[PDB]
Amino acid sequence: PVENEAVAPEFTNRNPRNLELLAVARKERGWGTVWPSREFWHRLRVIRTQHHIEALVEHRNGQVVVSASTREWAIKKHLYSTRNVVACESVGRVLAERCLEAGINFMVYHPTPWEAASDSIKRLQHAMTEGGVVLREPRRIYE
Amino acid sequence: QKRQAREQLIEECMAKMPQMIENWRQQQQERREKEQADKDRRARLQAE
Amino acid sequence: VTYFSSRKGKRKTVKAVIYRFLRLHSGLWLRRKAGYKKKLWKKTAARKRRLREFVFCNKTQSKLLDKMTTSFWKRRNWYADDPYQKYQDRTNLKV
Amino acid sequence: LASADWIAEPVRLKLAVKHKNRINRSGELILTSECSRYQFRNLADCLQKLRDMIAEASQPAKEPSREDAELRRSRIENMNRERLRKKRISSA
Amino acid sequence: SKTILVKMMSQAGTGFSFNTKRSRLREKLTLLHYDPVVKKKVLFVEQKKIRS
Amino acid sequence: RRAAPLGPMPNEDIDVSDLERLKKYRSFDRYRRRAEQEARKPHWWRTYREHFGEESGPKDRVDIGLPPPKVSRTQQLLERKQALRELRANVEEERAARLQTARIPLEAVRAEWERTCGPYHKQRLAEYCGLYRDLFHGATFVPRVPLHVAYAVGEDDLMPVYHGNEVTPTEAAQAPEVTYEADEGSLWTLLLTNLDGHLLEPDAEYVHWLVTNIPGNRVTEGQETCPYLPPFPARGSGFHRFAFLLFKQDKRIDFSGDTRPSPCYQLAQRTFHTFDFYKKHQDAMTPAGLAFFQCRWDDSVTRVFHQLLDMREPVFEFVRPPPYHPKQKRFPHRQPLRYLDRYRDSHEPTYGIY
Amino acid sequence: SKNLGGKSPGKRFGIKKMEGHYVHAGNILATQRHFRWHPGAHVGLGKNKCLYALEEGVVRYTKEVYVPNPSNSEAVDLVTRLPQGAVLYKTFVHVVPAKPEGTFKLVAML
RNA sequence: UCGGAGUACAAAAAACCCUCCGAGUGAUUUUAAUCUAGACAAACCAGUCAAAAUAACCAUAACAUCACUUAUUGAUCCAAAAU
Numbered sequence: 004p005v006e007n008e009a010v011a012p013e014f015t016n017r018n019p020r021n022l023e024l025l026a027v028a029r030k031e032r033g034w035g036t037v038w039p040s041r042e043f044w045h046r047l048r049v050i051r052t053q054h055h056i057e058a059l060v061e062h063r064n065g066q067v068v069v070s071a072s073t074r075e076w077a078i079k080k081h082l083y084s085t086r087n088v089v090a091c092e093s094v095g096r097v098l099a100e101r102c103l104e105a106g107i108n109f110m111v112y113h114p115t116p117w118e119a120a121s122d123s124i125k126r127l128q129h130a131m132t133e134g135g136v137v138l139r140e141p142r143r144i145y146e
Numbered sequence: 147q148k149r150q151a152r153e154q155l156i157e158e159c160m161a162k163m164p165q166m167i168e169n170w171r172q173q174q175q176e177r178r179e180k181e182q183a184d185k186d187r188r189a190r191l192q193a194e
Numbered sequence: 195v196t197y198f199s200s201r202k203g204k205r206k207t208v209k210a211v212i213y214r215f216l217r218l219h220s221g222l223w224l225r226r227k228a229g230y231k232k233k234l235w236k237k238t239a240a241r242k243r244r245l246r247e248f249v250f251c252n253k254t255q256s257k258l259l260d261k262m263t264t265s266f267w268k269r270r271n272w273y274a275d276d277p278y279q280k281y282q283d284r285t286n287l288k289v
Numbered sequence: 290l291a292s293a294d295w296i297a298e299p300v301r302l303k304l305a306v307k308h309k310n311r312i313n314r315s316g317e318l319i320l321t322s323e324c325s326r327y328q329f330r331n332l333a334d335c336l337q338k339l340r341d342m343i344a345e346a347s348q349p350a351k352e353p354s355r356e357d358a359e360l361r362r363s364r365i366e367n368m369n370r371e372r373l374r375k376k377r378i379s380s381a
Numbered sequence: 382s383k384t385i386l387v388k389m390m391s392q393a394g395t396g397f398s399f400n401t402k403r404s405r406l407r408e409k410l411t412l413l414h415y416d417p418v419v420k421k422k423v424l425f426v427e428q429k430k431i432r433s
Numbered sequence: 434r435r436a437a438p439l440g441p442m443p444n445e446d447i448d449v450s451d452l453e454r455l456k457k458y459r460s461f462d463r464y465r466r467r468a469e470q471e472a473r474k475p476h477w478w479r480t481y482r483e484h485f486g487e488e489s490g491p492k493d494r495v496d497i498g499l500p501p502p503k504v505s506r507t508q509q510l511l512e513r514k515q516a517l518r519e520l521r522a523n524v525e526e527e528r529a530a531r532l533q534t535a536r537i538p539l540e541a542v543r544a545e546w547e548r549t550c551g552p553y554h555k556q557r558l559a560e561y562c563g564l565y566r567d568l569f570h571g572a573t574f575v576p577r578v579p580l581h582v583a584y585a586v587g588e589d590d591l592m593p594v595y596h597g598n599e600v601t602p603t604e605a606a607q608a609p610e611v612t613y614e615a616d617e618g619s620l621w622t623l624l625l626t627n628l629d630g631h632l633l634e635p636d637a638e639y640v641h642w643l644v645t646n647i648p649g650n651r652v653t654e655g656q657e658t659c660p661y662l663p664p665f666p667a668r669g670s671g672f673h674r675f676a677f678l679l680f681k682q683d684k685r686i687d688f689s690g691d692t693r694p695s696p697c698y699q700l701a702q703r704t705f706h707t708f709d710f711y712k713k714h715q716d717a718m719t720p721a722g723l724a725f726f727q728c729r730w731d732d733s734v735t736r737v738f739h740q741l742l743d744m745r746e747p748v749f750e751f752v753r754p755p756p757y758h759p760k761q762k763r764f765p766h767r768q769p770l771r772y773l774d775r776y777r778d779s780h781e782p783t784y785g786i787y
Numbered sequence: 788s789k790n791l792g793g794k795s796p797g798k799r800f801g802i803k804k805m806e807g808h809y810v811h812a813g814n815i816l817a818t819q820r821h822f823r824w825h826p827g828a829h830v831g832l833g834k835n836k837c838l839y840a841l842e843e844g845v846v847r848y849t850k851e852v853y854v855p856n857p858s859n860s861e862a863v864d865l866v867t868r869l870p871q872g873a874v875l876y877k878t879f880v881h882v883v884p885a886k887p888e889g890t891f892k893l894v895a896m897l
Numbered sequence: 898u899c900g901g902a903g904u905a906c907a908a909a910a911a912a913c914c915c916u917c918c919g920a921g922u923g924a925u926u927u928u929a930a931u932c933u934a935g936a937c938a939a940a941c942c943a944g945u946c947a948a949a950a951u952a953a954c955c956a957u958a959a960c961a962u963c964a965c966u967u968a969u970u971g972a973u974c975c976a977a978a979a980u
């Protein structure tokens with residue numbers, strides 16, 4: 004027969020993002036008694052220090068995937084007062100384009116109740132939404 | 147005939163359902179507003 | 195239980211067992227959970243569902259009910275549109 | 290599908306467009322039945338699927354309604370992909 | 382502080398009644414419940430009084 | 434019985450007595466920062482990371498790549514402080530900042546990011562996507578030189594291929610254009626490798642486009658060892674990875690064992706191992722560029738399978754393990770009537786002798 | 788006499804699955820009256836503080852930091868009253884999944 | 898009769914006409930569904946949890962909450978409602 008016709012029916016996909024992108028990967032349900040919830044694939048974390056603002060996307064294992072910080076020279080040289088709301092929206096838009104480049108479209112954001120009412124982080128969420136990255140990571144198929 | 151009568155009555159009662167819901171909500175809101183106004187005026191007259 | 199009747203000399207059966215129990219031909223006995231119609235306003239939805247569900251009997255109760263009933267109630271019945279005809283038999287029992 | 294002359298040309302075209310996922314490389318449309326233990330019922334299911342496809346391609350009032358539970362993710366992904374594709378530079 | 386048991390019938394047309402506890406010193410009760418027959422939020426009103 | 438602690442206790446440093454004079458935090462987010470800092474330390478007790486695969490914790494990754502560029506720290510700091518001062522001296526920037534109406538040169542920011550710190554983010558994204566683990570299994574490299582890859586999907590429509598992007602096979606049917614800054618004194622090689630999608634060997638990978646002895650930037654002028662083949666991911670298994678590896682070489686590498694014929698439509702011949710390739714030609718080439726994208730099945734993959742590869746399109750599906758059920762009991766006590774349905778082979782009535 | 792009602796059966800509030808035990812989905816790992824063991828990865832919490840496995844795997848017990856829900860007023864007050872260097876620790880029960888999510892099997896060549 | 902603490906110091910169980918607290922329910926609205934894996938406990942009867950899937954609300958929760966929340970409860974048969 005055809006030399007290429009061999010199939011090896013046990014197909015193995017070694018891509019670590021394969022099931023995450025197919026939305027059939029095993030989300031880490033669980034803790035329930037601590038905060039924030041760890042049921043996700045990629046989580047957005049915003050650290051607002053007294054001098055700089057940094058925004059990360061992290062995997063379930065805690066590894067840093069894509070990060071944008073006002074400590075970076077690229078944003079520092081184009082930005083003034085790296086702590087303020089314009090700095091927050093700047094880093095939000097930069098992280099949005101970086102996530103789009105990296106292939107991440109869905110994240111989860113779990114801020115504190117006082118942080119959700121802040122003026123800067125609402126603008127960061129709006130900047131992500133207008134940049135194309137959407138929160139509310141999709142539900143797992145056959146959860 | 148029994149099945150058709152049941153379905154017709156169900157449709158008739160479901161057609162007006164949002165109207166009854168809104169009327170009940172308005173009645174409850176008026177009740178709570180009247181209670182709040184009575185309490186506020188009682189407190190105001192007691193203060194003086 | 196009347197092991198030897200005074201008229202025919204046969205073995206009698208108690209009617210309470212057949213009135214409140216059902217026997218599948220595989221030997222299992224099916225019953226309703228006690229208290230499934232009592233004070234439903236006082237019970238949680240999960241508890242009400244658990245009471246509504248049908249349940250089986252263990253070996254001791256099954257043997258007791260077999261002793262109380264006669265051989266007419268252990269026969270194979272082919273009813274018209276029987277709800278439990280699919281459950282009359284046991285499959286894939288590895289003992 | 291090409292040699293099936295018992296249905297019209299537009300119907301054949303519609304089956305070719307829609308059910309190309311289940312069309313063999315030789316052009317043979319293939320229908321699968323696995324539900325019942327009886328080959329009679331299996332063939333009945335195959336014929337019912339064939340009749341349903343024929344009727345769906347024959348009716349002109351097909352609005353092509355699409356589901357939304359699993360299509361929002363695809364829409365978002367296409368949105369974000371053409372957000373990068375929108376670069377306009379001549380090439381080739 | 383004695384309560385009362387009242388049977389409420391659905392106003393969605395279909396016959397569906399559920400029993401709930403209410404205070405005696407309250408007016409005729411009217412709430413929003415779920416009717417399995419129509420699978421929608423339906424206004425329920427107190428129809429009968431059963432238990433004290 | 435009691436056992437002595439096998440190391441320092443967590444809260445044994447601060448003094449229990451005289452809590453009033455001891456400083457306290459009043460901020461939940463501050464406590465959160467402290468707790469997340471503590472949770473990452475290698476404690477001597479059983480932790481979540483140890484059981485859930487910290488990947489052997491720290492690993493001394495072997496670096497096979499170009500040295501980082503040498504810059505003057507003092508001069509760089511002086512220029513950066515000067516730029517910050519000259520920016521802060523402005524008053525229109527202050528007014529824009531206070532009025533919250535100020536925009537950002539996103540293209541510029543991306544340019545300096547890719548110039549100064551892009552390689553490290555790209556390397557960590559390659560680590561997260563598992564490129565190094567499947568290409569060398571023991572080595573990591575930093576993509577020092579940017580590599581811009583783009584497909585042409587029309588007359589004015591260009592699809593960029595960043596790190597981890599998703600590209601349709603229809604968009605990737607044609608060969609792409611690759612650009613990277615390089616002087617006219619060096620030689621480069623470019624390799625497009627399909628990591629996942631080999632039907633037979635799980636540990637092997639496919640070749641798609643191998644060009645060698647590239648003079649500087651003109652890739653079209655350099656000879657192509659392997660003709661371009663469009664991506665052909667299977668219908669069932671989706672989201673395969675395709676990696677563009679760029680190697681900078683000193684000598685003019687010439688080989689005959691890695692050369693492919695003109696058609697090159699045989700999957701047996703298009704079987705590759707990047708580890709073996711780099712072991713064979715490790716002395717000259719050094720990896721300096723990386724560009725990988727995800728790719729799923731579309732309507733053109735069947736055409737690629739049929740016309741080009743001359744085979745039947747394979748179809749897979751994501752099957753799940755059958756539900757677990759305990760051993761069936763002779764007398765299932767207090768079990769629902771549906772207990773017998775959990776061990777039924779088929780929902781059909783079998784009459785054994787009737 | 789004067790003391791009445793002291794008789795009541797034990798509620799069997801305890802641990803059901805120890806470390807290393809292979810559990811399936813839905814198995815009750817441990818039941819409790821107050822929060823003694825906290826759920827972690829792939830361990831869900833019932834309404835009666837019981838802990839049940841959500842995935843089939845191996846049960847593990849760990850000591851981990853405790854960051855409470857910011858809406859929990861009592862725990863937030865405790866945290867804000869904690870001293871500078873103090874971090875809370877709790878015993879969490881985890882289920883480490885064993886079987887993969889699924890497999891890619893060939894069905895037909897079209 | 899039911900629950901909590903000690904007896905019963907660390908998985909479970911464990912008695913006395915042993916030592917002390919309690920319950921035979923209130924307040925409020927979020928009026929809290931169906932179906933089903935797998936489990937706890939248990940002589941039996943009873944009691945408890947619960948993933949996935951379904952129709953309505955954010956298109957991101959629904960386990961009703963509080964009073965130490967744990968106890969606030971009664972089997973068949975038989976009688977009544979409108980089934």
Ligand SMILES: [Mg+2]
Nearest residue numbers: 506507509510
């Ligand atoms: Mg410096």
Ligand SMILES: [Mg+2]
Nearest residue numbers: 793794795796
């Ligand atoms: Mg006791």
Ligand SMILES: [Mg+2]
Nearest residue numbers: 794795796797
């Ligand atoms: Mg006792």
Ligand SMILES: [Mg+2]
Nearest residue numbers: 803937938939
């Ligand atoms: Mg047991």
Ligand SMILES: [Mg+2]
Nearest residue numbers: 146948949950
């Ligand atoms: Mg659910």
